[PDB]
Amino acid sequence: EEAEKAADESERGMKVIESRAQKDEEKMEIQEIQLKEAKHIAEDADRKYEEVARKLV
Amino acid sequence: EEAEKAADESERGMKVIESRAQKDEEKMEIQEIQLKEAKHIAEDADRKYEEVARKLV
Amino acid sequence: DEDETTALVCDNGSGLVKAGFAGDDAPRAVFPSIVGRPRHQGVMVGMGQKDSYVGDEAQSKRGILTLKYPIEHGIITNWDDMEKIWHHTFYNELRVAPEEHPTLLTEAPLNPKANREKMTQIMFETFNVPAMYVAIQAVLSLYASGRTTGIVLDSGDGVTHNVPIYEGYALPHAIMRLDLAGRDLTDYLMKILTERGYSFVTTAEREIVRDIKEKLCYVALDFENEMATAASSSSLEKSYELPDGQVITIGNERFRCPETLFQPSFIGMESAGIHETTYNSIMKCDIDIRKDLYANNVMSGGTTMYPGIADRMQKEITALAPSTMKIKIIAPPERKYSVWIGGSILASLSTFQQMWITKQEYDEAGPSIVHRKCF
Amino acid sequence: DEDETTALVCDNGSGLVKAGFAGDDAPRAVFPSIVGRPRHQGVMVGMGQKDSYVGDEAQSKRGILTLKYPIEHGIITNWDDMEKIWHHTFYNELRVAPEEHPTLLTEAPLNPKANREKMTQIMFETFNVPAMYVAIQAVLSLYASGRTTGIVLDSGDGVTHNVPIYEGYALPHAIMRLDLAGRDLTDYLMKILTERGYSFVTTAEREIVRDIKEKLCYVALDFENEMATAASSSSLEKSYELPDGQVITIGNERFRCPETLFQPSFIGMESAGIHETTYNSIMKCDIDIRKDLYANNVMSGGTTMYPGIADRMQKEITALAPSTMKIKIIAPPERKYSVWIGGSILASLSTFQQMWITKQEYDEAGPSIVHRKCF
Amino acid sequence: DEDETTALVCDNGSGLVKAGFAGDDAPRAVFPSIVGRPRHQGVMVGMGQKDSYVGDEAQSKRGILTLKYPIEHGIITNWDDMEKIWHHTFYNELRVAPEEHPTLLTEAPLNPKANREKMTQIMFETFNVPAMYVAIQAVLSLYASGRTTGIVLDSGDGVTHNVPIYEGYALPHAIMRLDLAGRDLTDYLMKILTERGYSFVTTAEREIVRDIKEKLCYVALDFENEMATAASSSSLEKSYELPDGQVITIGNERFRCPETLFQPSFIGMESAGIHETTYNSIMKCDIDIRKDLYANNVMSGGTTMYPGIADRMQKEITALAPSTMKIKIIAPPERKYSVWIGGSILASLSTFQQMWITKQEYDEAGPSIVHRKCF
Amino acid sequence: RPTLRRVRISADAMMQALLGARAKES
Ligand SMILES: Nc1ncnc2c1ncn2[C@@H]1O[C@H](COP(=O)(O)OP(=O)(O)O)[C@@H](O)[C@H]1O
Ligand SMILES: Nc1ncnc2c1ncn2[C@@H]1O[C@H](COP(=O)(O)OP(=O)(O)O)[C@@H](O)[C@H]1O
Ligand SMILES: Nc1ncnc2c1ncn2[C@@H]1O[C@H](COP(=O)(O)OP(=O)(O)O)[C@@H](O)[C@H]1O
Ligand SMILES: [Mg+2]
Ligand SMILES: [Mg+2]
Ligand SMILES: [Mg+2]
C-alpha cells in the first residue's frame, strides 16, 4: 500500500512537471523571438540615427 | 516487487526531469534579463532618434 | 545517551509533538498531541494505576480513554496536559533530565501572554532548567528553507499563520492568524460522510478519518469540473479498506474536503480563504517587495503534505494577481520537519548560546519582564 | 415634510453618513457607512427578497450579513454601495425626492477624479437632480467654527486631512492626506487584544471593539509614565461589560491604542505621526502666518471625540515648537457635526443659490469640464 | 589602482554624488544622495550590524530603510550623513585613502559659511588630507563648455543657480539662488497623481515617480494648446509599466509637471519662474554685454536632461526680449557630467597644484581665515 | 453666527403624539 501511494504521487509529479517543462520550452522560444526582434529594431534605429546625425551636421 | 520497480523508475524520472526543469529555469532568468536590457536600450534609442529628428527639423 | 551539552529541540506543534536533540536532521520522538483519560472506574486489580495516558500509549487505546486535545486554535486549554507531555518526553523517551542541557522550544505566532508566562514558569520553577528560550516557528522554517525572503504559510492542526519575511526582516504587524486547519477539515469531512450515510460521533473515529484524510485526501485542480466529471464516476471514486476491515467507498469528497480552506463559507464564517487572506496580506505589504514575496513564498505545516497544493496555489494566485510577472512557488522537501531542523541548526551557534535566559535574572525580573526582553 | 426649497445637506463622511435638510443644527439621519450582503442562500419562503441591506438595517444584523466598507482610505471601491446608500437615504428616511430641491454634498480633500466624476454622473444622469455641488469638508468646518484662520485637522475613519486656512485663504499645495485613522486604530487594538488572549477574526466583533474604543479608549498624557504606573495596575485597568455579557478586562491597551497615531512605526510605515506631520506642514507654510496657525488650529472628525487629545497636542507641539510664544488650541463643542452644520448655513445664502451647477450646462460641457469649473 | 598623484574629483551634487579620479571624462562612482536608516529593531542574528546604509546599498532596499536626504535646498542638514558618504566613497568604491592625493570638491553657489567650515574641518582634522580646495560649480561647467562667456543655469535637485560669466568674469552680486528644482517637481507630480487617483505617501514611491519623471516627463512647447488637444487624448496619453508590474496610465501630467518651474504660483510662492528670473538677472547686468549673455547662455544640472527645454527657453526669451537680434541657446552634450569633467581638467594644471591649501597654514589661521583666502 | 434650534419639535406633530384626540385647539 505504501508503494502504491508512492507510485500514484509519482505519476502526478510526472504529469505536472512535464507540463512545467513544456511551458518553459514555449517561453524560451518566445523569449528568443522577442530578443531577436528587439535586436533588429535596435540595429535599424542606430542606422537611422547615424543617418540623421550626418544630415544634422 | 512490481510496485517497488515502478516506484524506482518513477524516482529516476523525477531526478532527470527535475534537473532539466532547473536548467530551463536558469535559462529563463538569463533570457529574460537579456530581453529586458535589449528592450530598454531600444526604447532609449527610439526616443533619442525621434528627438534628434525634431531638432533637425 | 548524549555526550554534547546542547539544547533539546522540542517542537510542540499542534497535533504532533516532535522532540529530539540538537544537531539531528529529524525528530526521533514523534507522537500526536492527545491526552487519554480513564473514562470508567474498574474493580480490577493489577493494572497500572496511572491516571493520565499520553502519546503512543494513548494512541494504542482510544476506545477506553476519552481523548482531549491539549491545544485548541492555539490557546492552551489545560496545563496539566502540558506538564504531562513534557514530563513524559523527558522521563520516558529521551531518557535525559532537563537539568543538564538547555531547551529551545518553538511556539506559534501571535499567542496569548498567559500561555507564554505559564510555560516559562513551569519550565523554571517546577523543573530545574538552566535556560529557556521561546522562538517563533516561521523564522526557523525560513532558516531550514535556506533563504531570507518569502512569506511562510504554516498550516498546523487548528491554526494557520501567514508570516511575511523579506531579507530576513520580520513583520509583526502583518502576521494574521486564522483558526482554519486540519481539525475544521476533519469536521467537514465527518459531516459530509455523515451525509453520505456512515454516521459516527466519537473521537476515535474522528482520528481514524483524520488519518484516512492524511493518506488519501488531495487538492483539486478544478473544483467544478471535477464535480461534473465525478457525477459519473469510474476511476474518480476509490474504495478504501479501513484498518478494521469495513469497506469504505469514498469518491469526490476527498478533493472537496480541503476545498473548505478556499471557501470558508462552508463553515459559515465571514473569514476569507487562505489564498485570499495571503493575497490581502501581500497588498498590506509594500509594493517594492511584493514581487519578491511572490517569487519566494514558502510553506510549512503537516497539512501541506497533501498532493496538489502547489498547483492550486499557482492557479489561484495567477487568477488573482497579474499574469505578466513570474510567480514561482517553492516547497522544500520534508517541509513539516524543516521547522524542527531549523531548531537544530539554531542551537549549535555560540552566539545563540549567548542569547539564552538563565534562572536568576528571570527570578528577579519576573515573567513579564522576560516577555519584554524577548520582544 | 419640507416646505422650503432648500438643498439637502448629506455629509457622506467615511464611517458615518449624516443626512439632513439645510437650516438644521444636527443631522437627523445618522447611520454607519456599511453594506450588509446576504452570505448564504436560504430555502425559506416569505422573508424580504432584498439583496442589499444598508445602514441600521445592516447594523441590526451583522452575524448573517458579510460587511463591506463602501469607502477605503478615501477611494471609492464599489459604486453599487454608493447608489444603495443614496437611494436608501432618499426613499427610506428623508421621505423626499431629489427632483424638488438641490443637494450640497461634502467630499474629502485630495480625492480621485474618478470618484468625483462618478458621483456627479450618478447624481445627474440616473437621478433627476436640478443642481449639484461638491464642497471640501475643511472650509465648511472652518465656517461652523466661526473663524477664518487656522489649520483644520479632520480625522475621519480611514483618512486624516490637515488643511491650513489663514484669513480664509485655502492652500491646495499644503494639504497632505494620510490614511491613518480609526480603522488602523481598530486593527491595532484588535491585534493587541489578540495578544492579550481574546482572539477574534470577524468584522462584527471588529465593529463591536470599535464601539468599545469610541466609548472607553482615551489618549494618554505621558505614555511611558503611564506604562510604568500601569505595570502595577489598580484603578488604571477597567472591567468592561460586553453588550452580550462576556466580562472583558482592559487595562493600559486603551491609552496605547490611539498612541499608534503618534508612532506610525507600530504599523511599520515610514510616515510621521499626525502631530509631526502637522508640524512639518506648518514649516511648509510661511513664517509670517505660522504664529496665527499656532493660535487658531481647529480639529474635526469623529475620531476627535476621545478625551485627552487637546492636552496631548499642546504638550507635543510645545516640545516641538519654541515655548516663548502662545500656542492655544481651540476645539469647538460637537465638532463632529460642525461640518454638517456648516453645510446648513452654507445652503441658505442666495449667492450660494447662484453658484449651483444645473443639468444642461453639465450635459453639454461633460463631467471633466465641470471639474475645471469648480477648480 | 591609481599611479598618478592627482586630486580626486568628487562632485557632491544634490541628488547624485559623482566621484572619480582626475583626468577621466566621466565619474565612475555615481550614486544618489540618500541615507537609509534601519527603521525597526530585529531579533535576528547574523545580519550586518551596520547602522547606516548609503548609496546603492540603500537604493537596493528602500522598503525597510527610512530615507533621509543629506542635503535640502542647499543647506546641509545632518553632518553624520556627510561623514558617511565620504567615508563610503573612500573605503568602499575608490579603494584609495585620502592621505596620498589631494581632493577637489565642488560646492554650490551662495552656500552658508557653516557648511563650508564644517566640511573643511571634517576634511582636515578627522581625515588626514594633504590639501583641500572648494570650487564653485558654475566656473567648472563653463570650463567644460569650452568658452568664457555666458550665463550658466545649474538646476540640481533642490536648488537652481543662475550665474552670469562674461569673458571669464564672475559676478558674485548677480548670482541668485532659488530652491525650485526636481524635488518640488516630484512633489507637484505626486500631488497631481494623488488627484488623478493613485495616492501614495511614502518616500520609496516618491523616488520611483522621480525616476519615472526622469525617464518620461518632458517640457511642452505650448501649454494651453497641448491642454486643449489632450482634452481628447489618443497618442498624447501614454501607459507606463511600473518596475513592479502595476499598469500606470499618465497623460498630460507629464508636460505639466516641469511647467511649475515656469509658474511658481502653482506652489503658492511669489518667486518668479526660472526664465523670468534669468531675464531679470540679464537686466541687472550691463547692457553692453547683455547681447553676449543672450548668445552664450549655458545650462547645467541633471534636471536639464528633459527633452524640450531648449525650444521652450527660446520661445519664452523671444517673447520676453526683442526679436530683432539673434538669441542662440547652446546646450553641450552630456552637460550633467560636464561640471565633473571640468574638475578633471582643472586638477591637471601645475598652477592649480600651486593653489591648494595645506594643513599647517589652515591650522594656524583657522577655518574663518581660510574663507577669506578663497574669497 | 446664529441659528434656530432644531430640537424645537413642531407642536402639531408633538401635540398629536402626546394627546391623541384631546388636541383640538393647539
Ligand atoms: N503525513 C501527513 N500527511 C497529511 N497531513 C498531515 C501529515 N502530518 C500531519 N498532517 C496534518 O498537519 C496537522 C498538524 O501539523 P503540525 O504537526 O502542527 O505541523 P508543524 O509541526 O510543521 O507545525 C494536522 O492537522 C494533520 O492532519
Ligand atoms: N462618538 C464617537 N466617539 C469616538 N469616536 C467616534 C465617534 N463617532 C465617530 N468616531 C470615529 O470617527 C471616525 C468617523 O469619523 P467621521 O464620521 O468621518 O467624521 P466627520 O463626519 O466629521 O468626517 C470613525 O473611525 C469612528 O471611530
Ligand atoms: N538622467 C536624468 N534625467 C532626468 N533628470 C535627471 C537625470 N539625472 C538627474 N536628474 C535630475 O537632476 C537632479 C539632480 O541634479 P544634479 O545631479 O545635482 O546635477 P549636477 O550634478 O549637474 O549638479 C535631480 O532632481 C534629478 O531629478
Ligand atoms: Mg505547522
Ligand atoms: Mg472627519
Ligand atoms: Mg546641477
DSSP secondary structure string for all residues of chain B: -HHHHHHHHHHHHHHHHHHHHHHHHHHHHHHHHHHHHHHHHHHHHHHHHHHHHHHH-
Phi, psi of C57, deg, nearest 5: -60, -30
CA distance C70 to C85: 9
Print the SS3 string covering D297-338.
Answer: CEEECHHHHCCCHHHHHHHHHHHHCCCCCCCCCCCCCCHHHH
User: Is D327:D295 a contact under the CB 8 Å cutoff?
Assistant: yes
Are residues D263 and D343 part of one domain? no
Is the C-alpha dihedral spanning E40, E41, E44, E50 positive or negative? positive
Sheet containing C298-300: give its strands across: C176-178, C160-165, C150-155, C298-300
Last residue of a domain, one of C230, C248, C274: C274
Range of the domain at D117: 5-31+73-138+338-371
**Residue C168 sits at the chain E interface (C-beta within 8 Å):** yes
**Which atom of ligand 2 has the smallest separation from the CA of D339?**
22
CA distance E244 to E274: 35
Are residues D254 and D214 part of one domain? yes
- The reply to whether ligand 2 has any atom less than 6 angstroms from the CB of D13 is yes
**Which atom of ligand 2 has the smallest separation from the CA of D301?**
22
Whether C170 and E246 lie within 8 Å, measured CB to CB: no
CA distance E60 to C292: 13
Determine the distance from the C-alpha atom of residue C367 to the mean position of all C-alpha atoms in its chain, rounded to a whole number.
26
Q: Which contacts qualify for C239-242: CB closer than 8 Å, 24 or more apart? A: C240/C212, C240/C216, C242/C208
Are residues E282 and E156 part of one domain? yes
Phi, psi of A7, deg, nearest 5: -65, -45
Helical ranges in chain E per DSSP H: 56-59, 79-88, 113-121, 137-145, 182-196, 203-216, 223-231, 253-256, 259-262, 274-284, 287-295, 309-320, 335-347, 350-354, 359-365, 367-374
Which CATH number belongs to the domain containing residue C313 in this structure? 3.30.420.40
CA distance E340 to E355: 19
Are residues D105 and D19 part of one domain? yes
Residues 6+ apart with CB under 8 A from C34: C54, C55, C58, C59, C67, C68, C69, C70, C207
Q: How far is the CA of E300 from the centre of ligand 3 (A)?
A: 9
CA distance C176 to C160: 9
CA-based nearest residue to D162, from D133, D134, D137: D137
Are residues C192 and C131 part of one domain? no
Q: How far is D25 from chain F (nearest CA, A)?
A: 6
Burial C263-274 (b: 16+ CB within 10 A, else e): ebeeeebbbbbb
Determine the distance from the C-alpha atom of residue C232 to the mean position of all C-alpha atoms in its chain, rounded to a whole number.
37
Domain tally for chain E?
A: 4
Are residues D225 and D144 part of one domain? no
Q: How far is the CA of E140 from the centre of ligand 2 (A)?
A: 59
Q: Give the count of beta carbons closer than 10 Å to the beta carbon of residue E356.
A: 15
- Cell representation of residue E98: 585620502
* Nearest ligand to residue C212 Cα: 1
Taking CA–CA distances from E246, the nearest residue in chain C reads C322
- The reply to whether ligand 2 has any atom less than 6 angstroms from the CB of D184 is no
Contact yes or no, B with F (3+ CB pairs under 8 Å): no
Residue-wise DSSP of D106-148:
EE-SS--HHHHHHHHHIIIIIS--SEEEEEEHHHHHHHHHT-S
Whether A16 and C215 lie within 8 Å, measured CB to CB: no
Are residues C217 and C91 part of one domain? no
CA distance C333 to D174: 55
Position of cell 519615472? E212
Q: How far is the CA of E297 from the centre of ligand 6 (A)?
A: 15
DSSP annotation of E169 reads: B
CA distance D343 to D362: 23
Three-state DSSP at E167 gives: coil
* Nearest ligand to residue D107 Cα: 2
- The reply to whether ligand 1 has any atom less than 6 angstroms from the CB of C182 is yes
CA distance D114 to D368: 10
Q: Are strands D8-13 and D16-21 parallel, antiparallel or unpaired?
A: antiparallel
CA-based nearest residue to B7, from A1, A18, A8: A8
User: Is E52:E85 a contact under the CB 8 Å cutoff?
Assistant: no
User: Is E11:E106 a contact under the CB 8 Å cutoff?
Assistant: yes
CA distance D345 to D357: 19
Are residues C287 and C143 part of one domain? yes
CA distance D60 to D62: 6
Residue type, E227: M
Which CATH number belongs to the domain containing residue E63 in this structure? 2.30.36.70
Q: Give the count of beta carbons closer than 10 Å to the beta carbon of residue D352.
A: 17
- Cell representation of residue C230: 465525478
Residue-wise DSSP of E36-77:
EEE-S----SSS-----EETHHHHT--SSEEEE-SEETTEE-
Q: Is A47 exposed, middle or buried (0-12, 13-18, 19+ CB in 10 A)?
A: exposed
Are residues C152 and C131 part of one domain? no
Residues 6+ apart with CB under 8 A from D50: none
User: Is D123:D115 a contact under the CB 8 Å cutoff?
Assistant: no
Are residues E287 and E148 part of one domain? yes
Which CATH number belongs to the domain containing residue D217 in this structure? 3.90.640.10
CA-based nearest residue to D212, from D196, D189, D235: D189
CA distance A17 to A5: 18
User: Is B38:A42 a contact under the CB 8 Å cutoff?
Assistant: yes
Q: How far is A21 from chain B (nearest CA, A)?
A: 6
Residues 6+ apart with CB under 8 A from D361: none
Instruction: Give chain E's length.
Output: 375
Burial E164-173 (b: 16+ CB within 10 A, else e): bbbeeebbee
User: Is D313:D329 a contact under the CB 8 Å cutoff?
Assistant: yes
**Residue D268 sits at the chain C interface (C-beta within 8 Å):** yes
Q: How far is the CA of D336 from the centre of ligand 5 (A)?
A: 7
Last residue of a domain, one of C42, C72, C102: C72
Whether C110 and D194 lie within 8 Å, measured CB to CB: yes
Q: Give the count of beta carbons closer than 10 Å to the beta carbon of residue D233.
A: 12
Q: Which of C140, C169, C356 is the best substitution to test chain E (most E C-beta atoms within 10 A)? A: C169
User: Is C356:C131 a contact under the CB 8 Å cutoff?
Assistant: yes
CA distance C341 to C353: 17
User: Is C327:C310 a contact under the CB 8 Å cutoff?
Assistant: no
Are residues E193 and E177 part of one domain? no
Print the SS3 string covering C69-117.
Answer: CCEECCEECCHHHHHHHHHHHHHHHCCCCCCCCCEEEEECCCCCHHHHH
Q: How far is B28 from chain C (nearest CA, A)?
A: 10
Phi, psi of C101, deg, nearest 5: -140, 155
* Residues facing C153 on adjacent strands: C162, C299
Last residue of a domain, one of C249, C274, C299: C274
Are residues E165 and E303 part of one domain? yes
Phi, psi of C276, deg, nearest 5: -70, -35
Phi, psi of E268, deg, nearest 5: 55, 40
Q: How far is the CA of E159 from the centre of ligand 6 (A)?
A: 8
Taking CA–CA distances from E231, the nearest residue in chain D reads D368
**Which atom of ligand 1 has the smallest separation from the CA of C302?**
12
CA distance E360 to D265: 48
**Residue D116 sits at the chain E interface (C-beta within 8 Å):** no
Ligand 1, atom 3, lies closest to the CA of: C214
- Cell representation of residue C89: 518526553
Breaks (C-N over 2.5 A) in chain A follow: none
Q: How far is CA E256 from CA D63, D373, E204, in A?
A: 51, 19, 23
User: Is C336:C299 a contact under the CB 8 Å cutoff?
Assistant: no
